[PDB]
């Protein structure tokens, strides 16, 4: 799934050069966004400290990033 | 509900980032990223309810992900195919 | 995001302009 | 005092969270 | 910044790279034959050079 193809995504729930930079750069935030997501939760994998990410650390991640956003 | 994303298009994404930071993802965490994905899209769509080059800089920026246009296009250049980074670098 | 407020201003609308303008009506017309 | 707009500019303020950042307001 | 790009100094940097040239070195991003150095050592002032064609491995 490209990062053009989840720019694609953001068109199909959204509604020519302009408005497609435009939403490539969406999907670019998404994406970035998304990436910020799992990064939390690897950090809270840390504070645990067992094998991987397990559910509940993507899950406070997403708390946090709402409380700090 | 229409909203969500798939959960294999979510490995195929999040593989390509596992190689910039090597996170690991239990099946259950797999769809919890892909249940929240919801909420994201909806806190997105409030954080960015309209598209513009000020605007998004501005809306990334607020995000934390990037502090100036600088390292917004940094970051374009880092998510995108080689030949759109360029065309977006027409835009700013 | 917003229940309370759109509950709220119903709520708000009815005793604030429809009650009223009813009861002057009511009032006015002995 | 008909325009609900003028009042939801004030309630959304004090209703979601400070650091909820409420810089664009969708249609 | 060709002579020092050439040579491989750390000196290239982008507060160094004026206004004007800040651009160039957004190209050299997009031909990725620069070492994306993410210097934690210093902030803003972040050192960028290519890898060095000269070093056999």
Same mark, same amino acid.
């Given at each position: 799934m490209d990062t053009e193809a989840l720019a694609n995504y953001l068109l199909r729930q959204l509604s020519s050069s302009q408005e497609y930079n435009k939403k490539l750069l969406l999907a670019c935030g998404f994406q970035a966004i998304l990436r910020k997501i799992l990064l939390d939760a690897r950090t809270r994998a840390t504070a645990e400290g067992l094998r991987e990410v397990y559910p509940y650390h993507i899950e406070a991640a997403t708390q946090a990033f709402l409380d700090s956003q | 509900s229409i909203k969500p994303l798939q959960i294999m298009d979510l490995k195929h994404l999040t593989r390509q980032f596992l190689n910039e930071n090597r996170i690991i993802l239990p099946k259950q965490t797999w769809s919890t990223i892909q249940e929240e994905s919801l909420n994201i899209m909806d806190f997105l769509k409030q954080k960015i309810g309209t598209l513009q080059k000020q605007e998004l800089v501005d809306s990334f920026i607020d995000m934390g992900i990037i502090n100036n246009v600088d390292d917004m296009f940094e970051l374009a250049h880092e998510l995108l195919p080689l030949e759109l980074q360029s065309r977006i670098e027409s835009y700013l | 995001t917003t229940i309370d407020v759109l509950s709220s201003l119903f709520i708000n609308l009815f005793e604030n302009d429809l009650i009223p303008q009813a009861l002057k009506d009511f009032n006015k017309s002995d | 005092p008909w325009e609900f707009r003028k009042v939801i500019q004030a309630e959304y303020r004090e209703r979601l969270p400070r650091n909820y950042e409420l810089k664009h307001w969708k249609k | 910044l060709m002579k020092r790009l050439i040579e491989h100094?750390? $000196?290239?940097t982008l507060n160094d790279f004026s206004s004007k040239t800040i651009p160039i070195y957004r190209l050299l991003l997009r031909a $990725?034959?620069? /070492?994306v150095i993410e210097g934690? /050592? $210093?902030?803003?002032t972040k050192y960028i050079k290519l890898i060095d064609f000269n070093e056999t491995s």
């Open positions: - | - | - | - | 100094d750390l $000196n290239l $990725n034959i620069i /070492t934690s /050592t $210093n902030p803003g």
